[PDB]
Design a protein around this ligand. Sequence first.
Ligand SMILES: Cc1ccc(NNC(=O)[C@@H](O)[C@H](N)CC2CCCCC2)cc1
Ligand SMILES: [Mn+2]
Ligand SMILES: [Mn+2]
Length: 369
Amino acid sequence: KVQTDPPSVPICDLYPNGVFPKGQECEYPPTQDGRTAAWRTTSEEKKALDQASEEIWNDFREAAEAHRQVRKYVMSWIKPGMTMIEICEKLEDCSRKLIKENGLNAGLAFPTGCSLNNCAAHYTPNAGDTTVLQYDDICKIDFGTHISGRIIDCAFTVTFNPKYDTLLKAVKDATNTGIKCAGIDVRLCDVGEAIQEVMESYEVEIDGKTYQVKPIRNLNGHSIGQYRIHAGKTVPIIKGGEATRMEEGEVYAIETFGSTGKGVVHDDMECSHYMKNFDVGHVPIRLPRTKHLLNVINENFGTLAFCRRWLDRLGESKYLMALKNLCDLGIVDPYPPLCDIKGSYTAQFEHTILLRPTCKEVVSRGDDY
Ligand SMILES: Cc1ccc(NNC(=O)[C@@H](O)[C@H](N)CC2CCCCC2)cc1
Ligand SMILES: [Mn+2]
Ligand SMILES: [Mn+2]
């Protein structure tokens, strides 16, 4: 079918067949020896294997298409003057429609991160936040969608002042380098090393000061699992990491962060992000308020991340203490904003890739980034 200017037509209605557009497909990187992998996108044994998980790939694609159309729409109206809340509500309303939100079967994978300046991630406004987007602000729009738990974790950076251009370019190039180096049997530490090489190859000048872009060392990429945004493996963006290898059938979020500060982040500001620990099982709770809140989370989010605004919209009131109890019990983990030093600028770019038996698919790739 056809999408209305302001996106409103759910993605599955634009593809009645049930088959969604594939992302960018690439040949796996050749081995150190010089061994090519073009045989994978050919081997009958791999082909059947890949086709066997087609429904899965397809679900990732449905979510990726939603992500592509939502972000394009956002890039058309995001502007200084708007509050962070106005920005997140407008984005999420469109996302809910295009993904055709349906309980845990289809919806938003996590809250809309819109971290500003020295803060690189995990910031989304809570109720009452009067923060307004400024002309010189560098905002990281990081939002996700999912179908049946197949998560699309994709992100980009927003600026209005050209002075940040090379900084954005550096991080974008670094993220793309990480995407190219990634592959079946590729060592994670090699990906991180390669990413840092590109990142540090860039130098920038902002308001009279020059800087060699630094990747944020304590931030990183990660493997993705069903309903588990952080499956267990990590993709470093600096050298010195694990020699652990990426494997066939795995899904990864290739994300990098560049900064003009220390290249290190720390918790800062009021927490807005929360997510149930995946490994913790059922826990009996008598405390009335804490019990109800946990039930609401299990029903509406499962192991998917959420924020306070999402609790508010569900009619929940005065739940902070109950939420703190859940955190203290280790049932829910808080994810406060991660920021570099005051006055520093940070940028981010992220894509979700599928390590298919036949090829490497950058499922969330768009004509934008
Ligand atoms: C240190 C470290 C840094 C980043 C990551 N992964 N990625 C992220 O957190 C972002 O790209 C996610 N979209 C945001 C989300 C991830 C789960 C917890 C709530 C916030 C994992 C570890
Ligand atoms: Mn993300
Ligand atoms: Mn991520």
